[PDB]
Every structure is written in C-alpha cells, then in structure tokens.
Amino acid sequence: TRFTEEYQLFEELGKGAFSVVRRCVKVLAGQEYAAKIINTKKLSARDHQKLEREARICRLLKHPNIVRLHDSISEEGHHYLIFDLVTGGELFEDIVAREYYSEADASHCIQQILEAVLHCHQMGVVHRNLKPENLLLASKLKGAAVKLADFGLAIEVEGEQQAWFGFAGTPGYLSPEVLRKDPYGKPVDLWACGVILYILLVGYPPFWDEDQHRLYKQIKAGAYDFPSPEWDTVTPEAKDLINKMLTINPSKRITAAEALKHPWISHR
Amino acid sequence: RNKLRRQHDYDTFVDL
Numbered sequence: 453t454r455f456t457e458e459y460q461l462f463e464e465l466g467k468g469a470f471s472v473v474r475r476c477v478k479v480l481a482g483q484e485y486a487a488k489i490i491n492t493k494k495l496s497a498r499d500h501q502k503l504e505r506e507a508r509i510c511r512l513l514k515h516p517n518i519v520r521l522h523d524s525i526s527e528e529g530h531h532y533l534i535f536d537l538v539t540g541g542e543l544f545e546d547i548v549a550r551e552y553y554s555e556a557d558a559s560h561c562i563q564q565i566l567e568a569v570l571h572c573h574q575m576g577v578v579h580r581n582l583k584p585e586n587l588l589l590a591s592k593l594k595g596a597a598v599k600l601a602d603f604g605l606a607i608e609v610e611g612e613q614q615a616w617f618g619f620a621g622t623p624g625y626l627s628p629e630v631l632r633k634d635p636y637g638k639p640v641d642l643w644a645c646g647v648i649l650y651i652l653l654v655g656y657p658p659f660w661d662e663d664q665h666r667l668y669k670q671i672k673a674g675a676y677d678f679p680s681p682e683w684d685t686v687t688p689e690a691k692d693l694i695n696k697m698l699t700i701n702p703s704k705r706i707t708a709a710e711a712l713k714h715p716w717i718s719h720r
Numbered sequence: 721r722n723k724l725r726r727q728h729d730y731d732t733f734v735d736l
C-alpha cells in the first residue's frame with residue numbers, strides 16, 4: 453500500500469511496547485517526518501480502537517504548538533502515523549536539566565501550551581492528560597517551540613456540554629472534578645496547565661504524596677503552598693495566574709482564552 | 721519538597 457511507496461524509512465528515533473518510530477522522508481516532497489510504526493497484530497480490539505480514535509482526534513488539530521499528524525495509514529500487519537519530526541526531547545527532561553525556568557521562559561513556555569490547549573478546545577478536543585512528558589521541544593535549538601503530543605486519552609466534546617467521560621489521566625495532574633466523579637470538559641486541561649506552570653517556576657509540583665489517597669485529598673481540597681524561600685522572589689501576578697488555574701470549582705476556573713489575556717502572559 | 725517524577729497515564733480508576 454501507500455506507506456512503503458510514498459515514504460522512505462531511515463534510522464530508529466525511539467521505541468515503545470508495540471511501536472517503533474523512525475525518521476522518514478515523503479519522497480515526492482523530500483520533507484522529513486517521524487513515522488510511528490505500530491504492530492496492530494499485537495494489539496487488543498480495545499487498543500486498536502484507541503489507536504484509530506487517537507488518529508481521528510489528532511488529525512483535527514493544525515497548530516504550530518501541536519505535534520501535527522500529517523497522515524494515517526493502515527497496511528497489512530501495521531499502522532503508520534506520520535508526525536512532525538521533533539528532536540528536542542520532552543519538556544519534562546528540559547525542566548529536570550535546567551532545575552526550573554525564569555518567569556520570562558516559564559511565561560513564554562505556558563503561553564505556547566495555552567495556545568495549543570485553546571486550539572484543542574476550539575476544535576472540540578479535551579486532552580485530559582497534559583504533563584511535561586506530553587510536551588515536546590521541536591529541536592535542541594535555543595528558542596525551540598513546545599509542541600503538545602499524545603492524544604491517546606483525548607475526548608471530543610459537544611460545544612460547552614459537560615459529561616462524565618470516565619476516570620482517566622495522570623494522578624498528579626488530575627482535576628478535582630474528575631476525582632469528585634463530576635461531569636467535566638475543557639476546564640480539566642486548565643487545571644493541568646496550573647500544575648505545569650507551578651513546576652516550570654520552581655521545578656517541583658504543587659501536589660505530591662507516596663499515598664495516592666492523600667494525593668487525591670490534597671487536589672480535591674486544592675491544598676497547595678508557595679513555600680519560602682524559592683517562591684518569595686516569584687512575582688504576585690505569576691502566583692495569581694496559578695491560583696486562577698488551580699480553582700477546585702471548574703466553573704470559576706480561568707479558560708485558555710482568558711489565561712492568554714492575563715497580565716503575566718499578555719504583558720510579556 | 722514535592723518530588724518531580726515521571727508519572728504514568730491510567731485509562732480507568734486504579735486504586736494505588
């Protein structure tokens with residue numbers, strides 16, 4: 453079929469449980485991409501439908517701060533996802549390496565993340581799984597764009613309609629409404645943006661505990677600090693945006709649109 | 721302080 457004949461495979465960039473990703477060239481254009489090659493023979497019916505939902509949802513998104521899915525091909529014993537080639541690794545790795553971001557860099561970073569989330573929301577997509585591991589740097593270059601990835605847990609929403617879409621995501625980044633088993637939607641991503649922004653500024657999260665029961669109590673109670681000394685030098689408008697994202701009532705939580713107008717971002 | 725660790729995605733409620 454059309455993958456082997458339209459795309460030329462080059463070296464392995466990474467691997468997962470049931471996938472290998474290789475650099476490839478669309479021979480006609482000579483443009484390079486990342487080909488995620490999935491052995492569908494080793495996938496359950498459930499994983500197979502997850503994959504085809506992920507492919508559908510990601511294809512809705514066309515934004516410089518989202519890892520673009522250009523093509524989806526279902527051949528003999530394989531599924532090929534053709535993505536933007538990204539060579540800068542995870543935002544998680546960059547934060548670890550640099551300890552934390554200056555307010556300038558943190559503001560620049562979360563602005564890009566909010567633009568990606570806003571685009572998702574305008575396309576009727578809620579990610580549900582925002583975290584530093586799911587944000588990739590386009591390159592190792594100085595001012596490389598942050599790109600949102602992994603729509604494996606993303607859902608399609610009907611305008612502003614909320615519903616119970618199930619208990620799904622990463623414990624440390626789960627919104628209070630999901631933990632409360634409340635109907636939810638777009639606001640869940642803005643909670644995760646708050647957790648990410650907090651991490652960018654001091655290099656550690658607002659909610660953590662070895663005991664998951666106690667972690668979920670902290671999140672539901674919205675019990676987070678700005679400890680001294682590291683937060684003492686952090687500007688109050690930075691703390692204000694975090695506070696406006698980490699509100700336990702999603703109806704009172706700042707949206708992606710409103711967040712991008714917030715002084716700390718719009719005056720930077 | 722709180723630990724910055726890699727965390728895994730769950731598709732359902734799994735009580736840890």
Ligand SMILES: Nc1ncnc2c1ncn2[C@@H]1O[C@H](COP(=O)(O)OP(=O)(O)OP(=O)(O)O)[C@@H](O)[C@H]1O
Nearest residue numbers: 465466467468469470471473486535536537538604
């Ligand atoms: N767009 C990309 N450009 C370059 N390398 C990539 C790209 N996407 C993924 N990789 C590399 O391939 C590795 C595995 O990719 P990915 O995480 O998508 O596979 P997986 O673990 O099988 O999938 P999933 O995370 O959905 O379980 C990544 O850790 C990374 O090193």
Ligand SMILES: [Mg+2]
Nearest residue numbers: 466467468469
């Ligand atoms: Mg992976």
